[PDB]
Amino acid sequence: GSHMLREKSEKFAFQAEVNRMMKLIINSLYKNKEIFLRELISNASDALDKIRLISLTDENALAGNEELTVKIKCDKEKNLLHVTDTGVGMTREELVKNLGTIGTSEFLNKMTESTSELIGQFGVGFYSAFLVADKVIVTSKHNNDTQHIWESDSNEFSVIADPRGNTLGRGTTITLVLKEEASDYLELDTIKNLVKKYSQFINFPIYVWSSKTVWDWELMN
Numbered sequence: 085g086s087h088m089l090r091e092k093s094e095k096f097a098f099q100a101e102v103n104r105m106m107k108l109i110i111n112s113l114y115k116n117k118e119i120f121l122r123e124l125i126s127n128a129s130d131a132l133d134k135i136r137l138i139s140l141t142d143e144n145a146l147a148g149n150e151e152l153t154v155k156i157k158c159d160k161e162k163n164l165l166h167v168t169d170t171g172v173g174m175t176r177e178e179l180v181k182n183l184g185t186i187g188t189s190e191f192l193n194k195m196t197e198s199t200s201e202l203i204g205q206f207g208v209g210f211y212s213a214f215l216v217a218d219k220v221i222v223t224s225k226h227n228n229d230t231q232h233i234w235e236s237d238s239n240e241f242s243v244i245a246d247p248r249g250n251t252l253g254r255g256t257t258i259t260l261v262l263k264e265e266a267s268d269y270l271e272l273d274t275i276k277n278l279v280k281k282y283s284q285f286i287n288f289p290i291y292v293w294s295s296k297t298v299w300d301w302e303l304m305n
């Protein structure tokens with residue numbers, strides 16, 4: 085089963101529109117970077133709504149994970165920020181299509197001609213992660229596929245089957261390899277303050293892995 089790596093069938097290029105959207109997002113929000121977290125939490129909330137809706141009609145929708153939560157983890161020694169939800173998750177096909185492609189023109193023009201509000205409205209808050217990260221990694225497990233990993237440094241992206249297997253049960257983990265100057269988002273206090281402000285209106289429970297020295301999930305909303 086070497087055909088896949090010898091052919092680079094896991095490597096993809098972004099759609100032109102997306103490259104343009106990413107720059108726009110990064111160019112205008114440079115003064116309001118913290119916004120990225122709200123957008124990831126916002127996306128997490130939407131995925132949780134979806135599985136919840138699916139659970140209404142499909143009895144075995146929550147089989148892979150009964151809880152509906154958003155958990156945030158700061159890994160200082162590894163320079164990573166993790167935002168995990170137990171929502172509907174994404175299939176390999178969706179990882180490629182939903183994150184790699186995309187009133188696109190009206191927005192491309194609207195953005196050019198505070199955009200923190202529009203970005204959310206247009207459903208492209210995902211890319212704001214690149215304001216604070218050199219690499220964004222999406223690990224996701226959907227009910228209809230095996231766990232896969234999507235990764236990108238913004239110049240291309242690849243998707244692979246997670247060799248770790250189904251560790252999520254169901255859901256998605258957004259992993260940010262934070263830029264050297266975005267180290268402050270590794271600080272609990274900072275994260276907690278941001279999460280507490282951007283979670284106040286999320287209907288699902290959001291936690292932050294914090295210390296009191298023992299560690300444990302701490303409810304934020």
Ligand SMILES: NCCNC(=O)[C@H]1O[C@@H](n2cnc3c(N)ncnc32)[C@H](O)[C@@H]1O
Binds near residue numbers: 169183186207256
């Ligand atoms: N067009 C902007 C980029 N595309 C997305 O953000 C889409 O990817 C999917 N997505 C993003 N974050 C997600 C997440 N955390 N869980 C499940 N699906 C997610 C949704 O379809 C979302 O609209």
